[PDB]
Design an enzyme around this catalytic site. Structure first.
Site, mmCIF file in Angstrom:
data_model
loop_
_atom_site.group_PDB
_atom_site.id
_atom_site.type_symbol
_atom_site.label_atom_id
_atom_site.label_comp_id
_atom_site.label_asym_id
_atom_site.label_seq_id
_atom_site.Cartn_x
_atom_site.Cartn_y
_atom_site.Cartn_z
ATOM 1 N N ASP A 289 -2.165 -0.436 5.774
ATOM 2 C CA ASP A 289 -2.590 0.391 6.891
ATOM 3 C C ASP A 289 -4.075 0.555 6.825
ATOM 4 O OD1 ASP A 289 -2.830 3.805 5.934
ATOM 5 O OD2 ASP A 289 -2.154 2.264 4.518
ATOM 6 N N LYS B 223 -12.093 29.754 -9.275
ATOM 7 C CA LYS B 223 -10.867 29.030 -8.935
ATOM 8 C C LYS B 223 -9.869 29.843 -8.119
ATOM 9 C CE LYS B 223 -10.660 24.618 -10.067
ATOM 10 N NZ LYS B 223 -11.910 23.795 -9.965
ATOM 11 N N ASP C 149 0.871 -1.172 0.000
ATOM 12 C CA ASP C 149 0.000 0.000 0.000
ATOM 13 C C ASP C 149 0.924 1.243 0.000
ATOM 14 O OD1 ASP C 149 -1.644 2.197 0.757
ATOM 15 O OD2 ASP C 149 -2.956 0.978 2.000
HETATM 16 MG MG LIG Z 1 -3.501 3.194 2.939
#
Ligand SMILES: [Mg+2]
Ligand SMILES: CC(C)CCC[C@@H](C)[C@H]1CC[C@H]2[C@@H]3CC=C4C[C@@H](O)CC[C@]4(C)[C@H]3CC[C@]12C
Ligand SMILES: [Rb+]
Ligand SMILES: [Rb+]
Ligand SMILES: [Rb+]
Lengths: 27, 286, 998
Positions: free
Chosen positions: C692, C462, C351
């Site tokens: 995670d 913007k 990840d």
């Molecule tokens: Mg993650």
């Protein structure tokens, strides 16, 4: 024989002890 | 799931090395064992042990090869006392006067218990050392002239008792003090006594009649034989015997009897059921 | 509910939906109203038919079974039948010539115990209490808001049904799977899915084919970060999308670790000998016909002498050490078996977000004074600042800090600036921190320049702006500061501040500013534009009523202060410590549900895509040639999109792995990460997985070993992992993969030394049959080697430093090079094992002749010797021994076989220390192994001199001369092994190595 039994119990006991002093040598 | 191959060449295809270089090993090893076990043998003098404390206070063997320290037969069955007779036949046959021959290699000695003939030093200096002998004839009604099996006890058996041969062991009998068989022929100086009992000094079911035999008519052993000088410096050596015929008026009953031997060089263990003593169960189920 | 390859394979294909329906394409389809919901009556009434909303966790095999399934672990049959034959036998002796002997009966209870005890040890091993669903089920909420008949009513989230009307508000969690009909200003933390925590917007705008991407689907587990919505529930619990995962994960066989499938291999070999022998010498037992119980008493021997006892738990302990050892480097281990695992590893899947990086949007660069500056993207601030010498900074700092709605959360001055809880978002706070950190406070710098009016960011324009009372003693009063998109913040600028002095926004800079907006964002960074104006003093005096409806003040020719840029950056160690895993020869692979443009940029950043290495696309645009024209094997690296994975086949995939070194699977299903792991696995390789995020679970739980992160990560990811980097340091993967290559070696040493001493334990019982000799080594005597003397000295190798840069050798190879093998058994058994026995017999041969029975007058005795009635047996002199008389010498023979064995094990414990280095090359710095010696030895003594060991163990006191027997033999063992290693080191390809190097 009596003089042999009290003979091994010593150089043995001075080896569970020297081992503790080599063990506690930093842990 | 295949040891082989091709894409391989089998497990090794030699193998030759992997195995040949294992005889070499196991042999070079074998040898190294052989050596160290040969030089180990340089040795422990050819004539005596090196340690003997493991045979001390010797024990009382016998001549009925004990099934379980016991003898159960009928006066009837001529097959019932075979196991006992053929084996007595075994040990006594080494005793026939036909084999004990000439002042060599033996030598006749006192029909009375003599002194302690210390043949000499355990050196090889004298060859086959000489051997005061013993005739089967000191055996009360436990000897005669038969066929291929002595005429032994059809009714009221017979069991000869022996001593444990040790290398250089000199028996020292009890003084006149507090034994068991009170001084009523206590051959003080030159004999080892053997007293038979049921179960200690406490009320045993004494159901026997105690009758002994021996050399000079003595229930014990003659110090005219010890020390024993090794089956090397003394093959042909024969040991003392001491039959005790059991003509008890009783029968059809198991009753434990102990045949202790006495002396200063005599001891006992409580777990060694034969160290400096006996123990035999007896029953002539007629 | 079919097989597993179905009930669990369908849980693997990505889903398909109905956000493509119109509002009247629903209505019918669920029957639900919409101005006003379901009936409440057709609600609980859909409840019955469809059944309560929420997930139900897999059942739990209790702490019975989990244990006993152990009491059959390989050696545990043999150890079991030895204590059964014992309970046999004894019986036999409680029927013949009275033997109320304690003997065998004890060996039955004894052995049996060891079989039990041995199991625990290997149970506090194969542990795995994996409470996963009691983590997902925690992400549904207590109540949910639905409407019926018109009433709006909250209720128990499980009373939501496939059909009704749910109003998610701000902050709270999303009850089922929603198709959004009404909706407002509704952003939503899609982290549990994407992996990133930046809010996406929810509208009924069907936008997209793919139901994971349309802004009109709301998701189970996720939370509404801001706004409000209304939805029709299309999936209810188990049946949803996240739930269809918590299923697929809490549904995954841990399976053999890579270690435990080594144990379950030497065992198969041992046990082998342990029968082949054991029955060779037993049909042959009673083919010469010892009794019955003279063979079943000889099995009980041959068994025990074969099963290594004090090993399978010696090994359990070697583990539990190096385990409890890393936990001091702050890496926690939840599964002992796993302490090995990391080492045997040849591929890592990580990840990106939160694991590889910090999941903290953060300022990476700047464009003060025509020069590009870089700042410290670490967590601790290793590297350098960038400047402030220039005034231009005082100015850009001012803007970036002044024009910003981010505060800090109350009570946080404690923690380090960076790790402080913001109350803003992505950029705003990422900027807030940049400043506060390196430009004094901001709670302050925003009362100096008090804001009088402001214009918050509007999608149309913007840009964002505030006018502030500059308070200088001179003092134009009225500072206008604005940021916004950059390319569209020059059309509002005419000047460019430099070192302190405004200038014209000529063409030099306009080209070089666009020349830096490219460079900068080509690093996958969000880039912002910052500009200000000192509002003409006259034109607005002290009082001016700025308006923000009717514009009112200038918006052009504003000054241009500079560009600032952020990113989600690696953590410190990550880059240095990824190239580490390659000196180790491990493959790293990015597996992330983020977008490919960041991915590949962060990839190259940590180092998963090395310098000068390209992909196809990378190439086409380095040769302006259409892509389908590039020879794909020219490309070492490649980025693959989760939307092509969708339609790939395992095989096109096995090819994508087989043929590329630097890989990046980007934007990926949860399933999809697994779908990849599984296929790295596909071909042998042992794979780790770092994560995670709840989006990870599945790989983090198909992982050969799965590593979570400690504080980043989620109850889930971790409660579905083996290791758990408590300090989130991604270097403990290198530390761990080393410490685990060493527990391997030091487990071979630890085993060898155990197994070696097994040979001078079998051969006694083996000759007892051959040369009807008096049994040299007794059974109860053997359970003194591996349970007594040998335990400690073995445990002790586990503490053995290395013999080279292990993390410099390719990773071991599950199929070849096993833990225990040909070249090793050839050594503990075929070699050093024999020599141990030649020395063990040699003294039995001395105990007996120094006591009479000159060797040869032994080659028969047993038959008679063991007879409890034949009290009258000739030695080699004439002497007649009783029973207890001679046995007390037999046991005296055990007693120092049991020693020449301990004495030889010195020489052993010291050459099962190293496998290549002379002992003078590696030395004896093992201040524990030495202890094992002193213990081992002295234990023996004690076991031989204490008033008791005789009556308890057949252990009788020895005579000085007695101990030094094996000595030449220990010293042989010693010298033989030393000369092996030499050879090898002198000829490393030569025959010896092939044959002795384990
Ligand atoms: Mg993650
Ligand atoms: C001495 C008596 C009682 C034991 C008989 C067992 C002997 C013959 C056995 C025990 C161990 C065996 C060795 C064990 C493993 C090696 C390694 C392999 O590459 C080939 C087989 C080989 C070389 C075996 C050869 C035969 C061997 C030496
Ligand atoms: Rb063993
Ligand atoms: Rb796992
Ligand atoms: Rb062993």
């Amino acid at each position: 024989y009596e003089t042999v039994r009290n003979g091994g119990l010593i150089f043995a006991a001075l080896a569970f002890i020297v081992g503790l002093i080599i063990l506690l040598s930093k842990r | 799931n295949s040891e082989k191959k091709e894409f391989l060449g089998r497990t090794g295809g030699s193998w030759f090395k992997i195995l040949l270089f294992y005889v070499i090993f196991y042999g070079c090893l074998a040898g190294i064992f052989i050596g160290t076990i040969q030089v180990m043998l340089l040795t422990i003098s050819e004539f005596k042990p090196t340690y003997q404390d493991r045979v001390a206070p010797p024990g009382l063997t016998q001549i009925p090869q004990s099934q379980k320290t016991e003898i159960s037969f009928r006066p009837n069955d001529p097959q019932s006392y075979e196991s006992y007779v053929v084996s007595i036949v075994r040990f006594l046959e080494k005793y026939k006067d036909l084999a004990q021959k000439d002042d060599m290699i033996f030598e006749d000695c006192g029909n009375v218990p003599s002194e302690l003939k210390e043949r000499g030093e355990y050196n090889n200096e004298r060859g086959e050392r000489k051997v005061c002998r013993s005739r089967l004839e000191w055996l009360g009604n436990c000897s005669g002239l038969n066929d291929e099996t002595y005429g032994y006890k059809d009714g009221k058996p017979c069991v000869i008792i022996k001593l444990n041969r040790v290398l250089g062991f000199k028996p020292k009998p009890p003084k006149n003090e507090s034994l068991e068989t009170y001084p009523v022929m206590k051959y003080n100086p030159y004999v080892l006594p053997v007293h038979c009992t049921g179960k200690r000094d406490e009320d045993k079911e004494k159901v026997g009649t105690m009758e002994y035999f021996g050399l000079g008519g003595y229930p014990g052993f003659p110090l005219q034989y010890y020390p024993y000088y090794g089956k090397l410096l003394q093959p042909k050596y024969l040991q003392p015997l001491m039959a005790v015929q059991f003509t008890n008026l009783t029968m059809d009953t198991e009753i434990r009897i102990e045949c202790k031997a006495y002396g200063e060089n005599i001891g006992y263990s409580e777990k060694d059921r034969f160290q400096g003593r006996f123990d035999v169960k007896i029953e002539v189920k007629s | 509910a079919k097989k597993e390859r179905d009930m669990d394979e369908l849980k693997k294909e990505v889903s398909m939906d109905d956000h493509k329906l119109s509002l009247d394409e629903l209505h019918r389809k669920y029957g639900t109203d919409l101005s006003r919901g379901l009936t409440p009556a057709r609600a609980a009434e859909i409840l019955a038919r469809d059944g309560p909303n929420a997930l139900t966790p897999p059942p739990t095999t209790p702490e019975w079974v989990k244990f006993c399934r152990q009491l059959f672990g390989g050696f545990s049959m043999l150890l079991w039948i030895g204590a059964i034959l014992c309970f046999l036998a004894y019986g036999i002796q409680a029927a013949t010539e009275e033997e109320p002997q304690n003997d065998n009966l004890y060996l039955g209870v004894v052995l049996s115990a060891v079989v039990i005890i041995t199991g625990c040890f290997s149970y506090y091993q194969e542990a795995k209490s994996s409470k996963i669903m009691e983590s997902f089920k925690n992400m549904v909420p207590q109540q949910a808001l639905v409407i019926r008949n018109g009433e709006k009513m909250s209720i128990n989230a499980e009373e939501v049904v496939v059909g009704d009307l749910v109003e998610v508000k701000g902050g709270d969690r999303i009850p089922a799977d929603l198709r959004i009909i009404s909706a407002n200003g509704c952003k939503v933390d899609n982290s549990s899915l994407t992996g990133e925590s930046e809010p996406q917007t929810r509208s009924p705008d069907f936008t997209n084919e793919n139901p994971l991407e349309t802004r009109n689907i709301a998701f189970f587990s996720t939370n509404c970060v801001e706004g409000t919505a209304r939805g029709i529930v299309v999936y209810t619990g188990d049946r949803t999308v996240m739930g269809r995962i918590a299923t697929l994960a809490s549904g995954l066989e841990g399976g053999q670790t890579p270690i435990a499938a080594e144990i379950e291999h030497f065992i198969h070999i041992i046990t082998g000998v342990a029968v082949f022998l054991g029955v060779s010498f037993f049909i042959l037992s009673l083919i010469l016909e010892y009794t019955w119980l003279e063979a079943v008493i000889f099995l009980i021997g041959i068994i025990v002498a074969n099963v290594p006892e004090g090993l399978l738990a010696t090994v359990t302990v070697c583990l539990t050490l190096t385990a409890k050892r890393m936990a001091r480097k702050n890496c926690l281990v939840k599964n002992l078996e796993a302490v090995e695992t990391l080492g045997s590893t040849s591929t890592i899947c990580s990840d990106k977000t939160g694991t590889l990086t910090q999941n903290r949007m953060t300022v990476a660069h700047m464009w003060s004074d025509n020069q590009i500056h870089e700042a410290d993207t670490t967590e601790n601030q290793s590297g350098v600042s960038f400047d402030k010498t220039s005034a231009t900074w005082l100015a850009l700092s001012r803007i970036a800090g002044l024009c910003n709605r981010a505060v800090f959360q109350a009570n946080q001055e404690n923690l380090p600036i960076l790790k402080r809880a913001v109350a803003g978002d992505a950029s705003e706070s990422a900027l807030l921190k940049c400043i506060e950190l390196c430009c004094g406070s901001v709670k302050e710098m925003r009362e100096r320049y008090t804001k009088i009016v402001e214009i918050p960011f509007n999608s149309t324009n913007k840009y964002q702006l505030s006018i502030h009372k500059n308070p200088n003693t001179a003092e134009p009063r009225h500072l206008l500061v604005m940021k916004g998109a950059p390319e569209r913040i020059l059309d509002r600028c005419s000047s460019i501040l430099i070192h302190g002095k405004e200038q014209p926004l000529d063409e030099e800079l306009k080209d070089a500013f666009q020349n830096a907006y490219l460079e900068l964002g080509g690093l996958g960074e969000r880039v912002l534009g910052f500009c200000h104006l000192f509002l003409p003093d006259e034109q607005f005096p002290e009082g001016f009523q700025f308006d923000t409806d009717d514009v009112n003040f200038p918006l052009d020719n504003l000054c241009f202060v500079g560009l600032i840029s952020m990113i989600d950056p690696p953590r410190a160690a990550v880059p240095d410590a990824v190239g580490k895993c390659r000196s180790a020869g491990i493959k790293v692979i990015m597996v992330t549900g983020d977008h490919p443009i960041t991915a590949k940029a962060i990839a190259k950043g940590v180092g998963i895509i090395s310098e000068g290495n390209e992909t196809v696309e990378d190439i086409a645009a380095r040769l302006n040639i259409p892509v389908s024209q590039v020879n794909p094997r020219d490309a070492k690296a490649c980025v693959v999109h989760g939307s092509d994975l969708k339609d790939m086949t395992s095989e096109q995939l096995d090819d994508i792995l087989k043929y590329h070194t630097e890989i990046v699977f980007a934007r990926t299903s949860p399933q999809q990460k697994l779908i990849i792991v599984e296929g790295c696995q596909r071909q042998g390789a042992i794979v780790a997985v770092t994560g995670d995020g709840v989006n990870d679970s599945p790989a983090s739980k198909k992982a050969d070993i799965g590593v979570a992160m400690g504080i980043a990560g989620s109850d889930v990811s971790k409660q579905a992992a083996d290791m758990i980097l408590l300090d989130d340091n991604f270097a403990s993967i290198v530390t761990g993969v080393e410490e685990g290559r060493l527990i391997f070696d030091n487990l071979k040493k630890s085993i060898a030394y155990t197994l070696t001493s097994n040979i001078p334990e079998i051969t006694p019982f083996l000759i007892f049959i051959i040369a009807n000799i008096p049994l040299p080594l007794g059974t109860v005597t053997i359970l003194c080697i591996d349970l007594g003397t040998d335990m400690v000295p073995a445990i002790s190798l586990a503490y053995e430093q290395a013999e080279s840069d292990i993390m410099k050798r390719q990773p071991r190879n599950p199929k070849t090079d096993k833990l225990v093998n040909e070249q090793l058994i050839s050594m503990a058994y075929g070699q050093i094992g024999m020599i141990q026995a030649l020395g063990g017999f040699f003294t039995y041969f001395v105990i007996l002749a120094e006591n009479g029975f000159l060797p040869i007058h032994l080659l028969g005795l047993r038959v008679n010797w063991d007879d409890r009635w034949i009290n009258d047996v000739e030695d080699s002199y004439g002497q007649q021994w009783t029973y207890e008389q001679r046995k007390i010498v037999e046991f005296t023979c055990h007693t120092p076989f049991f020693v020449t064995i301990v004495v030889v094990q010195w020489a052993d414990l010291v050459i099962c220390k190293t496998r290549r280095n002379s002992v003078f090359q590696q030395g004896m710095k093992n201040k524990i192994l030495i202890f094992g010696l002193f213990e081992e030895t002295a234990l023996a003594a004690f076991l031989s001199y204490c008033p008791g060991m005789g009556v308890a163990l057949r252990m009788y006191p020895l005579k000085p001369t007695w101990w030094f027997c094996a000595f030449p033999y220990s010293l042989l063992i010693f010298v033989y092994d030393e000369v092996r290693k030499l050879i090898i080191r002198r000829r490393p390809g030569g025959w010896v190595e092939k044959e002795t190097y384990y």
